[PDB]
Amino acid sequence: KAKELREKSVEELNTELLNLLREQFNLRMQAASGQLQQSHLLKQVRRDVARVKTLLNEKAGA
Amino acid sequence: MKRTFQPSVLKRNRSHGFRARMATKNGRQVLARRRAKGRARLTVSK
Amino acid sequence: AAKIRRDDEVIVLTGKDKGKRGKVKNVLSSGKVIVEGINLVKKHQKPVPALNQPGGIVEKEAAIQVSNVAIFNAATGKADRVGFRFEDGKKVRFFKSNSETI
Amino acid sequence: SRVCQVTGKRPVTGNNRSHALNATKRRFLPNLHSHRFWVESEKRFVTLRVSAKGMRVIDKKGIDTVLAELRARGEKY
Amino acid sequence: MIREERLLKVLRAPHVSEKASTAMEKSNTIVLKVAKDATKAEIKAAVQKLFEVEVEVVNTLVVKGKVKRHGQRIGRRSDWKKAYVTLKEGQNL
RNA sequence: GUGCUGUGAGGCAUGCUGGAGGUAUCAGAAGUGCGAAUGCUGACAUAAGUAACGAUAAAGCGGGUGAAAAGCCCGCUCGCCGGAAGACCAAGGGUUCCUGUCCAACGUUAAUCGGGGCAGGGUGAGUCGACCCCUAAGGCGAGGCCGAAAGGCGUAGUCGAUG
RNA sequence: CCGAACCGACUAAUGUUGAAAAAUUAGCGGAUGACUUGUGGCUGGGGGUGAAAGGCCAAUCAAACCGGGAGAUAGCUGGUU
RNA sequence: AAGGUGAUAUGAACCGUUAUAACCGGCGAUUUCCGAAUGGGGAAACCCAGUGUGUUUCGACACACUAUCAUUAACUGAAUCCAUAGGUUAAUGAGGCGAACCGGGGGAACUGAAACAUCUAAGUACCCCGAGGAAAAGAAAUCAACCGAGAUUCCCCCAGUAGCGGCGAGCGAACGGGGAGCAGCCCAGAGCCUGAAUCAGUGUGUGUGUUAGUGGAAGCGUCUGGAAAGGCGCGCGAUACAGGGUGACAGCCCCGUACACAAAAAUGCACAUGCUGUGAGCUCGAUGAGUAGGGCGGGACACGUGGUAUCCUGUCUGAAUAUGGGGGGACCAUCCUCCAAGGCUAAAUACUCCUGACUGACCGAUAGUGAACCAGUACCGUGAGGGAAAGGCGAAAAGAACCCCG
């Protein structure tokens, strides 16, 4: 998924990162209350957050 | 009867703790020895 | 690469099921394969009140060493050996006996 | 430390020997003195801790030559 | 402002227990598991933004983890932070 | 285990057990032979079902639960402490706290009970305490002075409560 | 000065594989002082400290403990298949 | 690459199968706190700041700087007129850790001498400082013996010899010979001629490794058996019969092995070629002074003061300087030989915390590491420190459904 993210701009990456963090929080609430059946989604959003932060770091010349 | 071990955490740390060991070259050689032996607990420091 | 793959049709070389034929259902990283209908064992399954409880004596396949089976050459009707070669830039398997691609 | 700033003389170890030749460890110390040396070229006195031998070296070579040696060695005065 | 990225990390889970349930229906107080380094001010801002309720006051405490055996092996669970979050009257979570 | 065999250390054969290694001959090399060392390690005896079961404050009975109750729960009675054998802190310890469940081991007996096993729960502060400001004894200590080296002492400072 | 707390330790019995590697019980001395106690600090091994007994310095003291020189040395005792 | 989401360790929810599943390698990114720990402090993993940039919903938030010392530079700046000390700032460097080997500063005793003091143990153990991949040493003020050799280092001899020695216990060379390896240079200075040798750095090439990988020959029947790789029979491969696995012992079942190949990227080495610095040659000069030597006290030399050369120097002295000086084991003469008081230098040598491969008339659970196993753990101790025990179901869990006493 790093290819499609690499097209977006720094400002689009920051909006995407925020959206993932909200999703990660909602999943965390559902998991804790026992209302999450698809536990595999937790790892998925966690690694997506890492992908976005890596690209934000690559674009800053870092 | 009063026995020899009368615990006090402040005295324990001042006498044998990590920073007391680091304060002298002889104390740093204690730490070097215990690291070479591979101790899991280097000092009394909790 | 692996000479025996899942869904291959194999024939058993050694053991109580020597000479029998089946299809590879599972390849285990320990060098063993589950072959359909072959190395059958009778498991005394205790009932599990958590889910459904069909606790009884179940028959099921046990893993067998992968060197104890051979790829089955249906043309010759015999066990064969596998080689590797490159055709059209891709690596393929072929029967050692008649040199045909698997 | 008991070290001559001009020559680098410092304590050395050796033995006391008795008539029966019993050896006991001892030191030999340098003959050090703090002395104010007049530096004509800078119109001031510089105090050095020097052995009597070092004072003879300064008499021979001149305080300016000696002080240049000290600056080369990084020895502050 | 506390940044939204920080606010999204401080609340970990609701805390379910008899004392927590009694706290909710008797004093309008919800009990949360929060990040170990969260402050009372961070918890207050996160609840107000993410749960969309008005908070009166936050009380906190640190729960020390228990030593447990597991097949001879000895271990220790992690310390965690509990927050009693009193909501303003009329609010409902 | 048994039989045979040689002057001896030993050798050979074979039944049973065992379930995968063994090794002639002639040479070669040794961590090469154990009953003692108040030898070393582990196992198991003896005394012996003996001494003892940890303050001579003390128990009795009815009911409950339970496979089982002198010891647990409830009740009535009795006795013991009461400048403590009551209540509450600091220190020290660190979950021993509460609830459910279990009785192998632990508990000097039994145990349905437990500071025991397992699981869940429980510690909410502007005012209490710590942190914090301030210093004592004392410690460290830029430069500094001193010392073969390591280091010693100490100024400005900076720490240090038991205040 | 008499006498509890508190600090001691003169006598006796018990205990001596103890309830306890120094105690228990009945008596005993000091108890406003050269008193007693909490917390923290300082002194280090031929060294400390000692109202002085070679006392005490972590159940160790006519030279602490730990590691090293180290397999010290043993004209002695034991053992040697 | 057709499988996969590390182990205990099943399950759950999932990913993938022709190439963004997983896995392996190169290069990157992220990398909390403590620790030299460096913003101040501190009972390690904690407490408390300053300054500047931003941001703000006025509650606040984010980020970056801020140790010490050394050197250099700038600005500033006392007593004190110039000055100097001092002060501030900046740049660059250092500190800490690590098994051995290496150089240096200090330096025991037990023991042996059948006691013991000289002597020995021994410049050992140990403490300290410093360096490197090696270190140190090194280009004759060296030996030799009237013939000659030609820096240093290491190995074999010389030789337990010559000597030293309460002439006791003990200590113990050199000359000379055979080998490994081999290399020579610069400053103390001008002129000429010039940028010429030579090393160091940095680019670029070509090879050659290292860090993933690819292909890799040839067996069936029958007997015993739970199972064949064993027996018996008949075949086949071999530049591959090293080794490991598979239900008993397999060249031909599997993984390998011989052999033949492979790199996007990073990197080692040896060449080549750039760029930078370095200076090459000739000539004429110069030739290391509180030094050599001496007196006194010690130490080092195999050599214990001895008839004792030579070396080092704590103390007091003190030349000649090439028409000169050092050495040749007291000393003198003669002769021979060398040129101190400035410095650099590869190789042969020492070691192994660590990585890979291979090997053993080495061990096989009281052995071998203390530790085959979650061991420097449990446990013991205030602490330094001390320090265990504990391996094996089966080929495969097929690890015993169900019934019975309790």
Ligand SMILES: [K+]
């Ligand atoms: K102390």
Ligand SMILES: [K+]
């Ligand atoms: K037999």
Ligand SMILES: [K+]
């Ligand atoms: K047998």
Ligand SMILES: [K+]
């Ligand atoms: K014995």
Ligand SMILES: [K+]
């Ligand atoms: K008995």
Ligand SMILES: [K+]
């Ligand atoms: K008991």
Ligand SMILES: [K+]
């Ligand atoms: K009983």
Ligand SMILES: [K+]
């Ligand atoms: K007092």
Ligand SMILES: [K+]
């Ligand atoms: K004394």
Ligand SMILES: [K+]
């Ligand atoms: K002790």
Ligand SMILES: [K+]
């Ligand atoms: K002593």
Ligand SMILES: [K+]
């Ligand atoms: K730090």
Ligand SMILES: [K+]
């Ligand atoms: K001696």
Ligand SMILES: [K+]
């Ligand atoms: K003797």
Ligand SMILES: [K+]
């Ligand atoms: K003697």
Ligand SMILES: [K+]
């Ligand atoms: K096989």
